[model samples]
Target: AGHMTDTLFLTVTASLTLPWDHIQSTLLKTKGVTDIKIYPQKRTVAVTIIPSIVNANQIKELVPELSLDTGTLEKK
Candidate 1:
């Protein structure tokens, strides 16, 4: 038997003005969201998300609800 791992790498890019913590905290509230790693440098923040309860499609829908217009949320 084989096991399948549904893993998705999503990156949240904050605006030059938005703080890294702001973006991180918002993602924490998302359902099924597991682990979120943040790397903040200069004027940008890179986020790696590990979600267990929510599927990719669900996450995509929840992302926009964060109301992050100045930033970009991408799923990889």
Candidate 2:
């Protein structure tokens, strides 16, 4: 299995109001999800992942209710 990694900045839809804790916990449980940072005010999440272990499709399955949009990770 490859150990390659990728970072994704996601904009979660406002219509989805699930608890941040639940989302964070679930992402951590996923195989390739190494880290997750939630920006509640912005409704965004920064996820560090190893694609070989887990991918975007798997994440979608984990949180089916939420609408996720892949965005760029900006440096501030």
TM-score of each: 0.40, 0.65
* Residue-level lDDT tens digits of model 1 in 1-76: 6323332334553234454465556666766554455445333333344434555565455443332324454455
Against the reference, the lDDT scores of all candidates come to 0.46, 0.69
Candidate 2 residue 6 Cα shift, in angstroms, is 2.6
Which candidate has the top score in lDDT?
2
Error of 2 at 10 (Å): 1.6
Error of model 2, residue 5, in angstroms: 3.4
Candidate 2 residue lDDT tens string, 1-76: 9546677776665455787788888888878888888865567777777655666677777786343545454333
